[PDB]
Design a protein around this ligand. Structure first.
Ligand code: COA
Ligand code: MYR
Ligand code: CL
Ligand code: CL
Ligand code: MG
Lengths: 392, 8
């Protein structure tokens, strides 16, 4: 697994070389599909290793949702030093996996035949995606996970081929996804940055480090935030704000080159506040007009050395739209709100306009690149600041 | 999927 483009050129991709993606290091100047829409699709599921079987996870069954939570809680993404692991909650998983248009056959699980234990997963959800001058119905792929005891046995390529087949059956032939590893071939490369909210805890669990020329007392003063936000008229998003949030987001996203195209129903799903999942605040001015909004989702991480201890509480910048409030002010209030709600750290990528505030608001650069990818769509790559899409 | 990053 190459995490660097230099590593990636010294690697061969036995699976990805067979897929309709551009080759690494080839410069793309065209825009369109690699292969045509298929007018007949394999009806039979791909073959799994002996002893494993496919299943479609109906998350409306609480027991099945808990099985998925447990698979991910124990086997999903860890940080580069294997000290933290994502701890997606069941309620978050419902938010991320049942948006408008979701299909249970696109919650694609692998179970042990004899025990029925869940040991692998991958998911698709539908999304309309604007990529340069084209809008395409696509899927977003997420939650690719193979049990630690099943790794390095070529199960991930089978999971990818099977979700591909199941998406093809529904008439969809493009996808978007992110990954921490370099594959053929990123359409954009983004970097996470981090803003300490509770510096004492971040240093104690070694999420961050004391600068060695700075004391703890000094670090606490440096990152201290006001107790209340400064922007006039900031308040939680409400049902009555759904249309204007939709309108604000649609107009704001036009300036980027890879963006979602959301219906008003999708806007309600992705932004309407749900405690411990998604937070959205709007700025309603002295005229009663909503002019700006900020949003972040809740994604804690298990502290692997102390599974007993409370998870590390992280907020992830989602979509932030400014038309009257300066973005710097909007994000300052996002930090204060996250601190108020008990988060330890606030995370943001360097995409969209985020580079204009990261250093000024005392974010520090993170240790991993997030690559963005399109499947069966060959187009030029773009800089992070033109990426306008944030996944979970 | 997402990436779990921390301070460089
Ligand atoms: C990611 C994971 C499913 C890969 O399974 P694995 O057993 O380690 O790798 P496998 O032997 O099954 O197959 C390797 C193939 O899958 C590819 N692959 C590995 N990780 C991948 C990823 N995140 N996304 C897409 N393809 C990936 C590899 O490039 C390789 O294909 P190649 O021959 O062209 O290079 C597994 O390691 C895992 O669950 N890790 C923790 C969760 C995670 O990181 N999920 C994905 C976040 S983007
Ligand atoms: C993070 O979990 C993303 C893992 C992405 C795996 C590769 C997905 C490739 C596209 C499959 C669907 C194609 C539908 C046309
Ligand atoms: Cl479901
Ligand atoms: Cl290119
Ligand atoms: Mg738009």
């Amino acid at each position: 697994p190459a995490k660097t483009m230099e590593e990636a050129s010294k690697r061969s991709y036995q699976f990805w070389d067979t897929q309709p993606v551009p080759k690494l290091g080839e410069v793309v100047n065209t825009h369109g599909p690699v292969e045509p829409d298929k007018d007949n699709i394999r009806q039979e599921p791909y073959t799994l290793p002996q002893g494993f079987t496919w299943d479609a996870l109906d998350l409306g069954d609480r027991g099945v949702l808990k099985e998925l939570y447990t698979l991910l809680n124990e086997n999903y993404v860890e940080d580069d030093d294997n000290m933290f692991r994502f701890d997606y909650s069941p309620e978050f998983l419902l938010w991320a996996l049942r948006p408008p248009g979701w299909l249970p056959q696109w919650h694609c699980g692998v179970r042990v035949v004899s025990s029925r234990k869940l040991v692998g997963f991958i998911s698709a959800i539908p999304a309309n995606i604007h990529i340069y001058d084209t809008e395409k119905k696509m899927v977003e792929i997420n939650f690719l996970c193979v049990h630690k005891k099943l790794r390095s046995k070529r199960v991930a390529p089978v999971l990818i081929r099977e979700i591909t087949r199941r998406v093809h059956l529904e008439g969809i032939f493009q996808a978007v996804y992110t990954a921490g590893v370099v594959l053929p071939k990123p359409v954009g490369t983004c970097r996470y940055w981090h803003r300490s909210l509770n510096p004492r805890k971040l240093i104690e669990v070694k999420f961050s480090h004391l600068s060695r020329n700075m004391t703890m007392q000094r670090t606490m003063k440096l990152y201290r935030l006001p107790e209340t936000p400064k922007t006039a008229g900031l308040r939680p998003m409400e049902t009555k704000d759904i249309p204007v949030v939709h309108q604000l987001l649609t107009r704001y996203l036009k300036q980027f080159h890879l963006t979602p195209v959301m219906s008003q129903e999708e806007v309600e799903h992705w932004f309407y506040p749900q405690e411990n999942i998604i937070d959205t605040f709007v700025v309603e001015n002295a005229n009663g007009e909503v002019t700006d909004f900020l949003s972040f989702y809740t994604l804690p991480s298990t502290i692997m050395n102390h599974p007993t201890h409370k998870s590390l509480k992280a907020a992830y910048s989602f979509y932030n739209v400014h038309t009257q409030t300066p973005l710097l002010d909007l994000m300052s209030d996002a930090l204060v709100l996250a601190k108020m709600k008990g988060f330890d750290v606030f995370n943001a990528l360097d995409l969209m306009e985020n580079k204009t505030f990261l250093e000024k608001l005392k974010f520090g650069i993170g240790d991993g690149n997030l690559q963005y990818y399109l499947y069966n769509w060959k187009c030029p790559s773009m800089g992070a600041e033109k990426v306008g899409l944030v996944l979970q | 999927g997402n990436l779990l990053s921390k301070f460089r």
